[PDB]
C-alpha cells in the first residue's frame, strides 16, 4: 500500500487537510491507508472515511448517470455514432465499481468483524448496504439480484441492531433508515415499504426529541427533514 510508510496520525491529519481542500480522492486514499493500519476507527475517523468515499463515488455516480442518459437516447430515429458512448460509460462504470469494491473490501477486511459497539457496527453495515446499493444502480447482469440482496441483508442487520441498541433519534439510526428507505423505493421496487419505513422512522424520532439537548435536537431534526423531503416526493 502506497500509504504503508506514513504514520496513522499523519494519514488522519492529511485526510482532514484534503477535506478542507476538497481533494476527496486524496482524502479517501489517506483514510484507506489509516484503515489498513489495522486499528479500529474512532467516531470521527469513521466519518472521515465515509465522507471521503461518499464524495468520490458521488462524482462517479453523477457522471455515470449523464453518460447512461446519452446512451439511452442514442438507442431510441437517433443517428448511429459508434461504440464511443458505451465505451466511455463502461469506463466510468468500471471505475465506480472499483471504488465500491475497495470500500467493501475495507469493511470485510476487517472493519465489520472488529466492530462490537452498536455505533460502529451499525455505521459499517450501513456503509456496506450503501456501496452494494451503488453497485446495484449500475448492475444489469445475472448478479444484479445477488447484489440487491447483499445490500438488503447489510441494511437489515444494521436495522436490527439499531432498533435494539440505539434511540429512535440517533443520527446513525436515522441515516440508515433514510438510506434503506431509498433502497426500497429505487432499487427493490418497493415504494410502499419505502414510504412506511420513512414515516415510522420520522414519527418515532419525533416522539423522542423531547429527551435531547439543543445540539442533539439539531442533529436529529436535520435528518428527519430528509425523510420528510422524500415522503413529500413519494406521496
Amino acid at each position: 500500500g502506497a500509504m504503508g510508510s506514513m504514520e496513522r496520525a499523519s494519514l488522519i491529519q492529511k485526510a482532514k487537510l484534503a477535506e478542507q481542500a476538497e481533494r476527496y480522492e486524496d482524502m479517501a486514499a489517506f483514510m484507506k491507508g489509516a484503515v489498513e493500519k489495522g486499528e479500529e476507527l474512532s467516531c470521527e475517523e469513521r466519518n472521515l472515511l465515509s465522507v471521503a468515499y461518499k464524495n468520490v463515488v458521488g462524482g462517479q455516480r453523477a457522471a455515470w448517470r449523464v453518460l447512461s442518459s446519452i446512451e439511452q437516447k442514442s438507442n431510441e430515429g437517433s443517428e448511429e455514432k459508434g461504440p464511443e458512448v458505451r465505451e466511455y460509460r463502461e469506463k466510468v462504470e468500471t471505475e465506480l465499481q472499483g471504488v465500491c469494491d475497495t470500500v467493501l473490501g475495507l469493511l470485510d477486511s476487517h472493519l465489520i468483524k472488529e466492530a462490537g459497539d452498536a455505533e460502529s457496527r451499525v455505521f459499517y453495515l450501513k456503509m456496506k448496504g450503501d456501496y452494494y446499493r451503488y453497485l446495484a444502480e449500475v448492475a444489469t447482469g445475472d448478479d444484479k439480484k445477488r447484489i440487491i440482496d447483499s445490500a438488503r441483508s447489510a441494511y437489515q442487520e444494521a436495522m436490527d441492531i439499531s432498533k435494539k441498541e440505539m434511540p429512535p433519534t440517533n443520527p446513525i439510526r436515522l441515516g440508515l433508515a433514510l438510506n434503506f428507505s431509498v433502497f426500497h423505493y429505487e432499487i427493490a421496487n418497493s415504494p410502499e415499504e419505502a414510504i412506511s419505513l420513512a414515516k415510522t422512522t420520522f414519527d418515532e424520532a419525533m416522539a423522542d426529541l423531547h429527551t435531547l439537548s439543543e445540539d442533539s435536537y439539531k442533529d436529529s431534526t436535520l435528518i428527519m427533514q430528509l425523510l420528510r423531503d422524500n415522503l413529500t416526493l413519494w406521496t
Binding site: 461518499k54 462517479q60 450503501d130 438510506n179 431509498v182 430528509l226 423531503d229
Partner: peptide, 12 residues
Amino acid sequence: KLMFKTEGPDSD
C-alpha cells in the same frame, strides 16, 4: 435522474 435524499454529502 431525480435523486432522492440519502445521508451525508449530496456529492452526486
